[PDB]
Amino acid sequence: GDKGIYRHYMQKEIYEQPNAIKNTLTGRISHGQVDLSELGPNADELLSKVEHIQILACGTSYNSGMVSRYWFESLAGIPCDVEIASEFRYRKSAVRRNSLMITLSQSGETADTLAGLRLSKELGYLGSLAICNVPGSSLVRESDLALMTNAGTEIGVASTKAFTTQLTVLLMLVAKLSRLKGLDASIEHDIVHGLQALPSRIEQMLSQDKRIEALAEDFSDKHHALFLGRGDQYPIALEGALKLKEISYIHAEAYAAGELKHGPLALIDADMPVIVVAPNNELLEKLKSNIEEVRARGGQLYVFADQDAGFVSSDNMHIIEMPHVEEVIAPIFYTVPLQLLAYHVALIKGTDVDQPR
Q: Cβ of residue 329: shortest distance to its own copies, in angstroms? A: 17
If binding is defined by CB under 8 A, does position 118 make contact with its own copies?
no
If binding is defined by CB under 8 A, does position 352 make contact with its own copies?
no
If binding is defined by CB under 8 A, does position 186 make contact with its own copies?
no
Q: Cβ of residue 115: shortest distance to its own copies, in angstroms? A: 11
Report DSSP letters for 139-190, one per residue: HHHTSSEEEE-------BSS-SHHHHHHHHHHHHHHHHHHHHTT--HHHHHH
Task: Pick what 344 binds: Zn ion, its own copies, none; C-beta below 5 to 8 Å, kind-dependent.
Answer: none
Across the beta sheet with 127-132, what order do the strands follow? 80-84, 52-57, 99-104, 127-132, 145-148
Q: Cβ of residue 88: shortest distance to its own copies, in angstroms? A: 10
Alpha-carbon gap, residue 163 to 63, rounded angstroms: 9
Alpha-carbon gap, residue 74 to 86, rounded angstroms: 27
Alpha-carbon gap, residue 34 to 111, rounded angstroms: 31
If binding is defined by CB under 8 A, does position 163 make contact with its own copies?
no
Buried residues in 31-66 as b, exposed as e (16+ CB within 10 A): eeebebeebeeebeebbeebebbbbbbbbbbbbbbb
Task: Pick what 96 binds: Zn ion, its own copies, none; C-beta below 5 to 8 Å, kind-dependent.
Answer: its own copies
Task: Pick what 70 binds: its own copies, Zn ion, none; C-beta below 5 to 8 Å, kind-dependent.
Answer: its own copies
What residues form DSSP beta bridges with 128?
101
If binding is defined by CB under 8 A, does position 74 make contact with its own copies?
yes
If binding is defined by CB under 5 A, does position 59 make contact with Zn ion?
yes
Q: Which of 266, 271, 310, 352 binds its own copies (CB under 8 A)?
A: 266
Q: Which of 14, 20, 36, 58 binds Zn ion (CB under 5 A)?
A: 58
Task: Pick what 334 binds: its own copies, Zn ion, none; C-beta below 5 to 8 Å, kind-dependent.
Answer: none
Q: Which of 35, 38, 45, 87 binds its own copies (CB under 8 A)?
A: 87
* Geometric angle at alpha carbon 93, from 133 and 125, rounded to 5°: 55
Question: Cβ(311)–Cβ(284) under 8 Å?
Answer: no
Of 58 and 332, the one with the shorter C-beta distance to Zn ion is 58
Phi, psi of 81 (to 5 degrees): -130, 145
If binding is defined by CB under 8 A, does position 299 make contact with its own copies?
no
- Strands 29-30 and 52-57, sheet pairing: unpaired
Q: Cβ of residue 133: shortest distance to Zn ion, in angstroms? A: 15
Chain positions contacting Zn ion, by CB under 5 A: 58-59, 223
Q: Provide the binding-site residues for its own copies, judged by CB under 8 A.
A: 58-60, 70, 72-74, 77-81, 84, 86-87, 90-96, 112, 224, 230-232, 234, 242, 245-246, 249, 251, 253, 256, 258-259, 261-263, 266-267, 282-283, 286
